[PDB]
Amino acid sequence: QSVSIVGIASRCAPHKLGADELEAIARRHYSSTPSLEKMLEINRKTRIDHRYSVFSSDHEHWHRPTIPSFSECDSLFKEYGIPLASAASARAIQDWGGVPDEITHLVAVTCTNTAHPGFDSVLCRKLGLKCNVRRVLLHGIGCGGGISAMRVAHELLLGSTQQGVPARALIVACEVPTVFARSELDIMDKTQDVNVAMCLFGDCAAALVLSNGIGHKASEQRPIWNILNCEPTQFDGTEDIAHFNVHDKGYHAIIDKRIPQLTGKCVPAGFQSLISSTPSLALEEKNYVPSNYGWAVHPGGYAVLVAAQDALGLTADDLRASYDAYRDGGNTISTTIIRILEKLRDEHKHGSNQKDKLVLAAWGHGITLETAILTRP
Amino acid sequence: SVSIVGIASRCAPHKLGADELEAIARRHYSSTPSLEKMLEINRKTRIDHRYSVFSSDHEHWHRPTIPSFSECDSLFKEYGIPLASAASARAIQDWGGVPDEITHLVAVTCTNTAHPGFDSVLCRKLGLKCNVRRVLLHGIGCGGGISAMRVAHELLLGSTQQGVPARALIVACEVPTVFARSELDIMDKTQDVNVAMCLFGDCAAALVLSNGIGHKASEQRPIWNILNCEPTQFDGTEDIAHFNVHDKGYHAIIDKRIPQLTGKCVPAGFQSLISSTPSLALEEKNYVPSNYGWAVHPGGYAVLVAAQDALGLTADDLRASYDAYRDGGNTISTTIIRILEKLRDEHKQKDKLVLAAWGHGITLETAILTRP
Ligand SMILES: CC(C)(COP(=O)(O)OP(=O)(O)OC[C@H]1O[C@@H](n2cnc3c(N)ncnc32)[C@H](O)[C@@H]1OP(=O)(O)O)[C@@H](O)C(=O)NCCC(=O)NCCS
Numbered sequence: 001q002s003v004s005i006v007g008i009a010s011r012c013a014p015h016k017l018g019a020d021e022l023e024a025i026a027r028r029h030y031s032s033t034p035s036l037e038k039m040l041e042i043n044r045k046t047r048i049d050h051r052y053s054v055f056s057s058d059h060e061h062w063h064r065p066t067i068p069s070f071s072e073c074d075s076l077f078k079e080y081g082i083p084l085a086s087a088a089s090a091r092a093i094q095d096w097g098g099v100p101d102e103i104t105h106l107v108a109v110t111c112t113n114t115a116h117p118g119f120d121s122v123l124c125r126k127l128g129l130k131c132n133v134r135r136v137l138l139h140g141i142g143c144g145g146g147i148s149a150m151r152v153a154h155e156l157l158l159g160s161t162q163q164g165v166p167a168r169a170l171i172v173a174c175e176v177p178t179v180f181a182r183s184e185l186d187i188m189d190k191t192q193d194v195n196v197a198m199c200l201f202g203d204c205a206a207a208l209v210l211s212n213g214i215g216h217k218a219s220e221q222r223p224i225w226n227i228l229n230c231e232p233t234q235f236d237g238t239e240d241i242a243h244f245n246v247h248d249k250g251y252h253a254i255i256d257k258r259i260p261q262l263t264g265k266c267v268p269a270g271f272q273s274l275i276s277s278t279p280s281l282a283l284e285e286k287n288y289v290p291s292n293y294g295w296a297v298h299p300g301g302y303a304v305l306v307a308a309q310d311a312l313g314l315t316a317d318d319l320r321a322s323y324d325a326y327r328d329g330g331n332t333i334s335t336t337i338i339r340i341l342e343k344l345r346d347e348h349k350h351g352s353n354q355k356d357k358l359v360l361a362a363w364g365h366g367i368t369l370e371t372a373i374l375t376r377p
Numbered sequence: 378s379v380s381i382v383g384i385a386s387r388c389a390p391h392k393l394g395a396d397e398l399e400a401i402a403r404r405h406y407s408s409t410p411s412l413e414k415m416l417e418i419n420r421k422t423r424i425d426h427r428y429s430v431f432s433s434d435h436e437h438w439h440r441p442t443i444p445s446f447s448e449c450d451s452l453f454k455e456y457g458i459p460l461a462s463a464a465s466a467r468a469i470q471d472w473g474g475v476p477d478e479i480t481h482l483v484a485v486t487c488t489n490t491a492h493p494g495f496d497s498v499l500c501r502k503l504g505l506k507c508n509v510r511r512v513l514l515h516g517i518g519c520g521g522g523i524s525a526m527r528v529a530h531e532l533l534l535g536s537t538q539q540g541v542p543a544r545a546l547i548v549a550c551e552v553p554t555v556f557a558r559s560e561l562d563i564m565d566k567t568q569d570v571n572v573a574m575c576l577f578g579d580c581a582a583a584l585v586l587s588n589g590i591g592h593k594a595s596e597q598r599p600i601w602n603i604l605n606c607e608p609t610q611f612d613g614t615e616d617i618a619h620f621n622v623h624d625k626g627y628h629a630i631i632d633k634r635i636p637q638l639t640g641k642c643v644p645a646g647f648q649s650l651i652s653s654t655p656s657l658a659l660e661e662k663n664y665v666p667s668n669y670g671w672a673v674h675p676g677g678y679a680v681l682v683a684a685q686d687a688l689g690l691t692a693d694d695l696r697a698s699y700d701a702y703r704d705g706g707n708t709i710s711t712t713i714i715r716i717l718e719k720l721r722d723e724h725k726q727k728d729k730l731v732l733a734a735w736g737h738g739i740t741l742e743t744a745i746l747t748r749p
């Protein structure tokens with residue numbers, strides 16, 4: 001038997017935050033300073049063609065004279081983020097074709113909200129999940145969160161397979177980083193520390209439905225991929241390579257310059273560990289060649305993709321869906337890997353030919369690479 | 378079977394008794410009706426001891442300003458994480474196995490938010506293997522101890538499915554007194570009495586769970602087997618407890634109706650647990666609460682009383698639960714583990730044991746454990 005992905009959907013926010021838009025927001029509230037000018041200059045070189053915010057150009061978020069309080073940042077996530085998550089979740093359930101009250105597990109993730117109850121609880125009510133649905137809300141993982149959620153759900157579902165009962169997991173990732181855009185601009189102006197987070201991140205929610213294959217119903221979509229194995233690797237390191245630190249007005253991002261370098265060193269090691277821990281693949285030497293797999297890589301930044309591409313012996317065309325998600329959507333944190341799976345799914349529906357095995361990889365906090373291997377059924 | 382094979386807890390070292398709290402409060406606020414009412418309630422909680430990571434002479438209690446959120450985070454890192462690594466180390470010691478053979482880490486807190494989370498730091502402090510499989514739970518509050526057990530239980534069943542060894546370290550770490558200065562200031566400004574000031578204390582606790590595969594001679598045999606875990610979310614407009622983010626940390630809102638809801642929902646929660654347990658669901662005697670041992674998260678004294686009456690139990694049935702509350706107070710997600718520890722220690726009881734605790738989203742987490 002095996003655990004499979006049986007539904008996929010994503011929903012970026014609706015309002016463009018292009019380079020012109022960001023410049024207009026920045027110069028509205030701050031005088032020219034060298035950090036402001038460097039940030040804007042870098043912004044135009046990200047090679048992101050589109051990213052999106054839940055806040056339209058005329059929204060008060062971009063015009064108010066004050067920085068949103070943390071409580072306001074919370075309310076904004078509830079007002080804009082949760083509906084985005086409910087839509088993406090509903091669409092994934094629709095793709096799956098099954099019924100909401102037959103979902104047994106909910107695995108949710110965000111790094112742009114902290115609340116008690118968490119947004120997973122709200123989602124249960126909005127989607128009409130059963131009263132005994134088994135919820136998990138992941139924290140502390142950041143961009144590794146999409147793969148982290150798949151890893152957890154994969155094992156939970158194997159646990160139900162152990163008991164011989166049906167299990168269907170909804171994975172939901174919800175990120176609204178533009179909520180913190182005003183705070184980050186203000187910090188960058190005050191410290192004159194250039195923050196490339198201003199340039200990279202956008203708003204999105206995405207979801208998967210996974211099944212353990214027990215008690216399959218005719219209404220359910222057959223397996224898109226099977227999940228064979230997931231393997232995280234935490235690498236040695238003084239401090240993390242990215243931080244998202246709490247403060248009075250929300251979270252502040254610290255993005256280390258060394259990320260592309262470290263990506264080049266660690267991704268091949270991560271991949272090697274993934275294969276060696278996969279009993280059905282660990283023995284044969286050919287399984288340790290990256291080009292024998294399709295690839296999906298979390299595009300933390302353009303240079304991050306380049307670094308992985310070169311280190312893995314791949315071509316940019318191998319990573320086409322990863323570049324495409326980055327180019328149209330930007331870095332949407334935990335949701336990005338799901339947007340890439342959707343792109344890959346959609347391309348296969350259009351006669352495209354892809355490898356039989358597919359590796360997912362993404363950096364998560366604690367210098368930890370999350371990886372997964374998926375197989376075509 | 379998935380089993381619990383190691384248990385440990387560690388409350389913070391400094392007493393926060395009634396005299397101490399009053400001294401802190403009057404140091405910074407002139408008398409107001411809400412202040413006097415809070416202090417009056419504080420002396421009626423029937424908590425004999427609760428603890429803080431902050432000594433009476435610590436700047437936390439003397440500084441004229443309310444700590445920033447960044448400070449609150451640093452404080453958790455400085456005092457909370459060492460408490461967590463001590464509890465974790467001691468649970469691993471109780472287990473008897475070696476750190477790099479822990480396969481899963483399930484951590485939980487509601488008194489810190491960080492990227493990376495405190496789970497990552499613990500991996501390094503404890504020397505867990507580089508591919509240890511971490512999960513940091515959020516949004517669950519006092520239900521987190523049982524929530525963590527529920528998650529770890531299923532993950533380990535997942536390894537049983539693959540036929541491989543699994544050992545899960547569960548770690549709960551709560552330092553609510555970090556937010557005591559902010560809560561006092563909010564209560565003063567709004568004159569809204571906040572009983573959170575009276576109930577909560579600092580503590581870390583840990584469990585080791587095993588799926589029983591690849592058992593080594595050095596490992597402690599099963600203390601309990603975990604048979605089933607079952608959460609029930611009940612209908613309701615707003616939660617019965619909130620822990621809401623704001624500029625200087627989190628602010629607690631504790632609803633007056635909790636004990637009443639406890640009486641209504643706990644029996645339903647129990648019934649759902651048994652009906653969802655194939656090996657018990659059929660026999661009608663299994664639906665009688667007094668046929669089980671009980672551990673219940675003591676959100677407050679009146680919460681214990683409500684569950685006790687509604688389940689037809691005695692206070693002696695809930696002795697370990699009252700004892701944890703009396704000596705340690707409400708330590709959030711860690712409390713259920715402190716109760717398991719007491720129960721284990723007393724043994725060194727009935728064949729089956731039910732755990733129950735309120736978690737956010739009006740959700741009751743429950744578990745059924747059995748004697749091996
Ligand atoms: C930001 C980025 C798109 C710029 O692309 P580019 O212009 O082709 O790259 P360059 O090396 O020419 O960088 C241009 C400028 O960006 C600056 N820059 C790059 N990464 C930076 C970082 N993490 N923080 C601050 N500045 C940074 C460089 O210092 C350089 O400044 P200069 O013009 O004063 O010399 C690219 O460097 C990138 O993708 N970086 C990875 C971002 C990342 O780590 N993402 C993960 C987030 S968790």
Ligand SMILES: CC(C)(COP(=O)(O)OP(=O)(O)OC[C@H]1O[C@@H](n2cnc3c(N)ncnc32)[C@H](O)[C@@H]1OP(=O)(O)O)[C@@H](O)C(=O)NCCC(=O)NCCS
Nearest residue numbers: 418421422570572618631632633635636676677678679680
């Ligand atoms: C707080 C507590 C220990 C007080 O014990 P008690 O004095 O025997 O209980 P009483 O009913 O006499 O309450 C005394 C006072 O506490 C007040 N009080 C009780 N619960 C309160 C709450 N949640 N918020 C604010 N005030 C509260 C009562 O209004 C009453 O005020 P009054 O004396 O001015 O009329 C008890 O009410 C309790 O344990 N409640 C449960 C707390 C809870 O829900 N905890 C869960 C945290 S998630």
